[PDB]
Amino acid sequence: APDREKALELAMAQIDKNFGKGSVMRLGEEVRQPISVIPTGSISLDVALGIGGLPRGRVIEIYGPESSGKTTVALHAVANAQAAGGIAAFIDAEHALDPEYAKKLGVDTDSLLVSQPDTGEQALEIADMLVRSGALDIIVIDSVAALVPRAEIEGEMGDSHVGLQARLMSQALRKMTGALNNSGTTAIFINNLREPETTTGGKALKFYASVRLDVRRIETLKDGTDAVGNRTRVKVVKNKVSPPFKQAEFDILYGQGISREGSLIDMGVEHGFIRKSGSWFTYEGEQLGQGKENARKFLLENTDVANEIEKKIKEKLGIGAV
Numbered sequence: 001a002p003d004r005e006k007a008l009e010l011a012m013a014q015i016d017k018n019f020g021k022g023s024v025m026r027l028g029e030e031v032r033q034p035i036s037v038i039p040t041g042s043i044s045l046d047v048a049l050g051i052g053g054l055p056r057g058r059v060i061e062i063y064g065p066e067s068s069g070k071t072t073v074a075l076h077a078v079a080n081a082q083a084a085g086g087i088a089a090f091i092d093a094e095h096a097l098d099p100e101y102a103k104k105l106g107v108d109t110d111s112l113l114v115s116q117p118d119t120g121e122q123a124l125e126i127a128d129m130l131v132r133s134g135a136l137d138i139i140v141i142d143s144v145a146a147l148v149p150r151a152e153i154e155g156e157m158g159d160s161h162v163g164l165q166a167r168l169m170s171q172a173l174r175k176m177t178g179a180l181n182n183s184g185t186t187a188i189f190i191n192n193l194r195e196p197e198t199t200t201g202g203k204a205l206k207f208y209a210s211v212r213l214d215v216r217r218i219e220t221l222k223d224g225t226d227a228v229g230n231r232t233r234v235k236v237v238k239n240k241v242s243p244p245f246k247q248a249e250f251d252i253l254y255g256q257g258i259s260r261e262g263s264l265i266d267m268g269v270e271h272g273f274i275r276k277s278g279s280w281f282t283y284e285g286e287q288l289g290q291g292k293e294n295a296r297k298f299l300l301e302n303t304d305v306a307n308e309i310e311k312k313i314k315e316k317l318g319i320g321a322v
Protein backbone atom coordinates (compact mmCIF):
# COMPACT_ATOMS: atom_id res chain seq x y z
CA ALA A 1 0.00 0.00 0.00
CA PRO A 2 2.88 2.45 0.64
CA ASP A 3 5.09 4.11 -1.97
CA ARG A 4 7.80 6.16 -0.26
CA GLU A 5 8.56 8.69 -2.97
CA LYS A 6 4.83 9.32 -3.60
CA ALA A 7 4.07 9.75 0.11
CA LEU A 8 7.22 11.82 0.42
CA GLU A 9 6.49 14.28 -2.42
CA LEU A 10 3.07 14.71 -0.89
CA ALA A 11 4.54 15.33 2.54
CA MET A 12 7.01 17.89 1.26
CA ALA A 13 4.27 19.62 -0.75
CA GLN A 14 2.09 20.06 2.32
CA ILE A 15 5.15 21.14 4.30
CA ASP A 16 5.97 23.95 1.85
CA LYS A 17 2.34 25.04 1.54
CA ASN A 18 2.21 25.40 5.34
CA PHE A 19 5.45 27.29 5.87
CA GLY A 20 6.62 28.54 2.47
CA LYS A 21 8.46 27.32 -0.64
CA GLY A 22 11.88 26.10 0.45
CA SER A 23 10.91 24.98 3.95
CA VAL A 24 12.34 21.61 2.97
CA MET A 25 14.41 20.44 0.00
CA ARG A 26 16.79 17.82 -1.41
CA LEU A 27 20.33 19.25 -1.54
CA GLY A 28 21.05 17.85 -4.97
CA GLU A 29 17.90 19.60 -6.19
CA GLU A 30 18.22 22.16 -8.95
CA VAL A 31 15.93 25.15 -8.34
CA ARG A 32 14.05 26.70 -11.25
CA GLN A 33 12.42 29.77 -9.66
CA PRO A 34 14.60 32.65 -10.99
CA ILE A 35 13.33 35.10 -8.33
CA SER A 36 14.45 38.70 -8.54
CA VAL A 37 17.99 38.83 -7.20
CA ILE A 38 20.86 41.28 -6.63
CA PRO A 39 24.17 39.98 -8.08
CA THR A 40 26.69 39.58 -5.26
CA GLY A 41 29.57 40.89 -7.37
CA SER A 42 31.03 37.38 -7.20
CA ILE A 43 30.07 35.01 -9.97
CA SER A 44 30.92 32.03 -7.74
CA LEU A 45 29.00 33.31 -4.72
CA ASP A 46 26.12 34.11 -7.11
CA VAL A 47 26.12 30.48 -8.27
CA ALA A 48 26.68 29.25 -4.73
CA LEU A 49 23.38 30.89 -3.82
CA GLY A 50 21.88 28.90 -6.68
CA ILE A 51 19.75 31.87 -7.79
CA GLY A 52 22.27 34.27 -9.26
CA GLY A 53 22.63 36.37 -6.14
CA LEU A 54 20.87 37.78 -3.11
CA PRO A 55 17.11 37.20 -3.23
CA ARG A 56 14.94 40.32 -3.13
CA GLY A 57 12.69 41.29 -0.24
CA ARG A 58 14.64 39.18 2.22
CA VAL A 59 16.77 39.52 5.30
CA ILE A 60 20.35 38.67 4.48
CA GLU A 61 22.99 38.28 7.18
CA ILE A 62 26.62 38.51 6.19
CA TYR A 63 28.85 37.57 9.10
CA GLY A 64 32.51 36.86 9.64
CA PRO A 65 35.62 38.46 11.23
CA GLU A 66 36.94 41.94 10.52
CA SER A 67 38.55 42.34 7.08
CA SER A 68 37.10 39.14 5.64
CA GLY A 69 35.45 40.81 2.65
CA LYS A 70 31.94 41.28 4.03
CA THR A 71 31.41 45.01 3.56
CA THR A 72 32.86 44.74 0.03
CA VAL A 73 30.23 42.27 -1.01
CA ALA A 74 27.58 44.38 0.68
CA LEU A 75 28.87 47.30 -1.39
CA HIS A 76 29.04 45.38 -4.67
CA ALA A 77 25.48 44.35 -3.98
CA VAL A 78 24.54 48.03 -3.62
CA ALA A 79 26.33 48.91 -6.89
CA ASN A 80 24.57 46.23 -8.93
CA ALA A 81 21.22 47.19 -7.46
CA GLN A 82 21.79 50.81 -8.51
CA ALA A 83 22.83 50.03 -12.10
CA ALA A 84 19.41 48.41 -12.27
CA GLY A 85 18.16 51.86 -11.32
CA GLY A 86 17.36 50.95 -7.74
CA ILE A 87 17.61 53.16 -4.66
CA ALA A 88 19.97 52.26 -1.77
CA ALA A 89 20.14 53.17 1.91
CA PHE A 90 23.03 52.63 4.32
CA ILE A 91 22.21 52.56 8.02
CA ASP A 92 25.74 53.30 9.27
CA ALA A 93 26.40 52.73 12.95
CA GLU A 94 30.13 52.08 12.78
CA HIS A 95 31.25 55.17 10.89
CA ALA A 96 33.74 53.11 8.90
CA LEU A 97 32.45 53.29 5.32
CA ASP A 98 35.00 54.64 2.88
CA PRO A 99 32.82 56.13 0.11
CA GLU A 100 35.90 56.65 -2.03
CA TYR A 101 36.51 52.91 -2.05
CA ALA A 102 32.78 52.49 -2.69
CA LYS A 103 32.70 54.49 -5.93
CA LYS A 104 35.54 52.24 -7.05
CA LEU A 105 33.26 49.21 -6.76
CA GLY A 106 30.73 51.00 -8.93
CA VAL A 107 28.59 52.62 -6.26
CA ASP A 108 26.94 55.93 -7.03
CA THR A 109 27.64 57.61 -3.70
CA ASP A 110 25.94 60.93 -4.35
CA SER A 111 22.63 59.07 -4.55
CA LEU A 112 23.17 56.75 -1.58
CA LEU A 113 21.06 57.48 1.47
CA VAL A 114 23.04 57.30 4.70
CA SER A 115 21.92 57.53 8.27
CA GLN A 116 23.92 57.61 11.48
CA PRO A 117 21.47 56.66 14.31
CA ASP A 118 21.87 57.64 17.94
CA THR A 119 20.57 54.39 19.38
CA GLY A 120 19.88 50.83 18.30
CA GLU A 121 16.13 51.41 18.35
CA GLN A 122 16.53 54.45 16.16
CA ALA A 123 18.78 52.72 13.63
CA LEU A 124 16.40 49.83 13.00
CA GLU A 125 13.34 52.07 13.23
CA ILE A 126 14.78 54.42 10.60
CA ALA A 127 15.52 51.47 8.38
CA ASP A 128 11.98 50.28 8.91
CA MET A 129 10.49 53.67 8.01
CA LEU A 130 12.51 53.75 4.79
CA VAL A 131 11.88 50.14 3.78
CA ARG A 132 8.10 50.49 3.97
CA SER A 133 8.00 53.31 1.44
CA GLY A 134 8.72 50.63 -1.17
CA ALA A 135 11.21 52.90 -2.89
CA LEU A 136 14.34 51.03 -1.79
CA ASP A 137 15.81 48.03 -3.57
CA ILE A 138 18.45 47.36 -0.92
CA ILE A 139 19.32 48.53 2.60
CA VAL A 140 22.52 47.73 4.46
CA ILE A 141 22.88 47.97 8.23
CA ASP A 142 26.53 48.10 9.18
CA SER A 143 27.19 46.23 12.42
CA VAL A 144 24.66 44.16 14.28
CA ALA A 145 26.68 44.69 17.42
CA ALA A 146 26.55 48.46 16.98
CA LEU A 147 22.77 48.36 17.46
CA VAL A 148 23.22 48.83 21.21
CA PRO A 149 19.94 49.62 23.04
CA ARG A 150 19.26 53.20 24.13
CA ALA A 151 19.17 52.31 27.82
CA GLU A 152 22.68 50.90 27.57
CA ILE A 153 23.84 53.93 25.58
CA GLU A 154 22.44 56.51 27.97
CA GLY A 155 24.06 55.93 31.34
CA GLU A 156 21.84 53.18 32.76
CA MET A 157 22.82 50.86 35.58
CA GLY A 158 23.69 47.21 35.93
CA ASP A 159 20.09 46.87 37.07
CA SER A 160 17.64 45.49 34.48
CA HIS A 161 20.76 44.30 32.65
CA VAL A 162 18.49 41.89 30.74
CA GLY A 163 19.38 40.58 27.26
CA LEU A 164 17.64 43.61 25.80
CA GLN A 165 19.81 44.20 22.74
CA ALA A 166 18.69 40.84 21.33
CA ARG A 167 15.05 41.47 22.18
CA LEU A 168 15.56 44.78 20.38
CA MET A 169 16.69 42.95 17.27
CA SER A 170 13.83 40.44 17.49
CA GLN A 171 10.96 42.91 17.73
CA ALA A 172 12.50 45.01 14.95
CA LEU A 173 12.91 42.10 12.58
CA ARG A 174 9.50 40.72 13.51
CA LYS A 175 7.89 43.70 11.81
CA MET A 176 10.50 44.69 9.22
CA THR A 177 10.43 41.35 7.38
CA GLY A 178 6.77 41.94 6.68
CA ALA A 179 7.51 45.22 4.94
CA LEU A 180 10.63 43.75 3.31
CA ASN A 181 8.53 41.14 1.50
CA ASN A 182 5.89 43.62 0.32
CA SER A 183 8.51 46.22 -0.60
CA GLY A 184 10.91 43.74 -2.14
CA THR A 185 13.86 45.46 -0.52
CA THR A 186 16.76 43.21 0.33
CA ALA A 187 18.12 43.92 3.77
CA ILE A 188 21.74 42.96 4.36
CA PHE A 189 22.76 42.95 8.00
CA ILE A 190 26.52 43.06 8.45
CA ASN A 191 27.39 41.00 11.47
CA ASN A 192 31.06 41.39 12.29
CA LEU A 193 31.28 38.21 14.42
CA ARG A 194 34.97 38.72 15.67
CA GLU A 195 37.15 39.16 18.77
CA PRO A 196 25.75 33.70 23.82
CA GLU A 197 24.59 34.74 20.33
CA THR A 198 26.70 35.91 17.39
CA THR A 199 27.06 39.47 18.72
CA THR A 200 23.98 39.24 20.98
CA GLY A 201 21.47 40.31 18.32
CA GLY A 202 22.38 37.75 15.67
CA LYS A 203 20.60 35.02 17.63
CA ALA A 204 17.21 36.23 16.44
CA LEU A 205 18.70 37.06 13.04
CA LYS A 206 19.72 33.41 12.70
CA PHE A 207 16.01 32.61 12.37
CA TYR A 208 14.75 35.65 10.45
CA ALA A 209 17.29 35.42 7.63
CA SER A 210 16.50 33.75 4.31
CA VAL A 211 20.18 33.60 3.55
CA ARG A 212 23.21 33.67 5.85
CA LEU A 213 26.73 34.01 4.54
CA ASP A 214 29.81 32.90 6.47
CA VAL A 215 32.50 35.21 5.08
CA ARG A 216 36.03 34.24 6.05
CA ARG A 217 39.60 35.05 5.04
CA ILE A 218 41.74 32.14 3.84
CA GLU A 219 44.88 33.34 2.10
CA THR A 220 46.98 36.37 1.21
CA LEU A 221 47.45 36.99 -2.52
CA LYS A 222 51.09 37.65 -3.42
CA ASP A 223 51.95 36.36 -6.92
CA GLY A 224 55.63 36.40 -6.00
CA THR A 225 56.12 37.69 -2.44
CA ASP A 226 54.41 41.10 -2.08
CA ALA A 227 51.12 42.52 -0.70
CA VAL A 228 48.36 42.74 -3.38
CA GLY A 229 45.06 41.32 -2.12
CA ASN A 230 43.34 38.53 -0.17
CA ARG A 231 41.24 35.48 -1.08
CA THR A 232 37.90 35.28 0.67
CA ARG A 233 35.85 32.13 1.22
CA VAL A 234 32.07 32.40 1.68
CA LYS A 235 29.82 29.56 2.90
CA VAL A 236 26.07 29.76 2.31
CA VAL A 237 25.19 28.19 5.67
CA LYS A 238 21.52 29.04 5.26
CA ASN A 239 19.42 29.28 2.13
CA LYS A 240 15.64 29.23 2.19
CA VAL A 241 15.37 29.70 -1.58
CA SER A 242 17.74 26.99 -2.74
CA PRO A 243 19.83 24.05 -1.49
CA PRO A 244 22.13 25.51 1.21
CA PHE A 245 25.66 24.78 2.35
CA LYS A 246 27.34 25.52 -1.00
CA GLN A 247 30.75 27.25 -1.04
CA ALA A 248 32.28 29.96 -3.19
CA GLU A 249 35.71 31.61 -3.28
CA PHE A 250 37.12 34.78 -4.78
CA ASP A 251 39.94 37.30 -4.65
CA ILE A 252 39.70 40.90 -3.47
CA LEU A 253 42.70 42.99 -4.46
CA TYR A 254 43.61 45.85 -2.16
CA GLY A 255 41.96 49.05 -3.36
CA GLN A 256 39.81 47.13 -5.82
CA GLY A 257 36.77 45.02 -5.29
CA ILE A 258 36.08 41.41 -6.10
CA SER A 259 38.37 40.56 -9.02
CA ARG A 260 36.36 39.62 -12.09
CA GLU A 261 39.32 38.26 -14.08
CA GLY A 262 40.42 36.39 -10.98
CA SER A 263 37.08 34.62 -10.75
CA LEU A 264 37.03 33.93 -14.51
CA ILE A 265 40.24 32.00 -14.11
CA ASP A 266 38.95 30.00 -11.12
CA MET A 267 35.50 29.41 -12.60
CA GLY A 268 37.28 28.53 -15.84
CA VAL A 269 39.60 25.81 -14.56
CA GLU A 270 37.03 23.93 -12.50
CA HIS A 271 35.09 23.78 -15.75
CA GLY A 272 37.76 22.74 -18.19
CA PHE A 273 37.45 25.81 -20.41
CA ILE A 274 40.88 26.93 -19.41
CA ARG A 275 43.50 24.20 -19.00
CA LYS A 276 46.21 24.60 -16.34
CA SER A 277 49.34 22.69 -17.30
CA GLY A 278 50.72 22.50 -13.76
CA SER A 279 51.87 26.13 -13.19
CA TRP A 280 51.03 27.48 -16.65
CA PHE A 281 47.57 28.70 -17.63
CA THR A 282 46.29 28.38 -21.20
CA TYR A 283 43.03 28.88 -23.10
CA GLU A 284 41.91 27.29 -26.35
CA GLY A 285 45.58 27.02 -27.21
CA GLU A 286 46.61 30.56 -26.22
CA GLN A 287 49.11 30.77 -23.36
CA LEU A 288 47.94 33.03 -20.53
CA GLY A 289 51.10 33.04 -18.45
CA GLN A 290 52.64 31.29 -15.47
CA GLY A 291 51.22 32.23 -12.09
CA LYS A 292 47.56 33.02 -11.53
CA GLU A 293 48.58 36.70 -11.47
CA ASN A 294 50.11 36.86 -14.95
CA ALA A 295 46.93 35.26 -16.24
CA ARG A 296 44.84 37.69 -14.18
CA LYS A 297 46.84 40.48 -15.81
CA PHE A 298 46.57 38.74 -19.16
CA LEU A 299 42.78 38.68 -19.00
CA LEU A 300 42.64 42.29 -17.84
CA GLU A 301 44.61 43.53 -20.86
CA ASN A 302 43.04 41.14 -23.41
CA THR A 303 39.45 42.18 -22.72
CA ASP A 304 38.35 40.20 -25.79
CA VAL A 305 39.33 36.88 -24.26
CA ALA A 306 37.85 36.63 -20.78
CA ASN A 307 34.75 38.14 -22.32
CA GLU A 308 34.36 35.00 -24.44
CA ILE A 309 35.34 32.87 -21.38
CA GLU A 310 32.74 34.62 -19.28
CA LYS A 311 30.38 33.79 -22.12
CA LYS A 312 31.24 30.10 -22.02
CA ILE A 313 31.06 29.81 -18.22
CA LYS A 314 27.80 31.75 -18.27
CA GLU A 315 26.40 29.69 -21.10
CA LYS A 316 27.14 26.51 -19.13
CA LEU A 317 25.53 27.66 -15.88
CA GLY A 318 23.21 30.70 -15.87
CA ILE A 319 22.20 34.38 -15.87
CA GLY A 320 20.08 33.21 -18.81
CA ALA A 321 16.50 32.48 -19.99
CA VAL A 322 13.95 30.36 -18.05
Ligand SMILES: Nc1ncnc2c1ncn2[C@@H]1O[C@H](COP(=O)(O)OP(=O)(O)O)[C@@H](O)[C@H]1O
Pocket residue numbers: 064065066067068069070071072073098101192229230252253254255256
Ligand atom coordinates in the same frame (compact mmCIF):
# COMPACT_ATOMS: atom_id res chain seq x y z
N1 LIG B 1 38.57 51.53 2.41
C1 LIG B 1 39.27 50.62 1.75
N2 LIG B 1 40.34 50.96 1.03
C2 LIG B 1 41.03 50.05 0.36
N3 LIG B 1 40.70 48.76 0.39
C3 LIG B 1 39.64 48.35 1.08
C4 LIG B 1 38.88 49.28 1.80
N4 LIG B 1 37.89 48.62 2.40
C5 LIG B 1 38.00 47.34 2.06
N5 LIG B 1 39.06 47.17 1.27
C6 LIG B 1 39.46 45.89 0.63
O1 LIG B 1 38.41 44.94 0.91
C7 LIG B 1 38.95 43.90 1.75
C8 LIG B 1 37.91 43.38 2.75
O2 LIG B 1 37.52 44.44 3.64
P1 LIG B 1 36.01 44.56 4.18
O3 LIG B 1 35.17 43.53 3.53
O4 LIG B 1 35.59 45.98 4.08
O5 LIG B 1 36.15 44.18 5.74
P2 LIG B 1 34.93 43.42 6.49
O6 LIG B 1 35.03 41.95 6.41
O7 LIG B 1 34.93 43.96 8.01
O8 LIG B 1 33.58 43.99 5.84
C9 LIG B 1 40.16 44.54 2.45
O9 LIG B 1 41.06 43.51 2.85
C10 LIG B 1 40.73 45.31 1.26
O10 LIG B 1 41.37 44.42 0.34
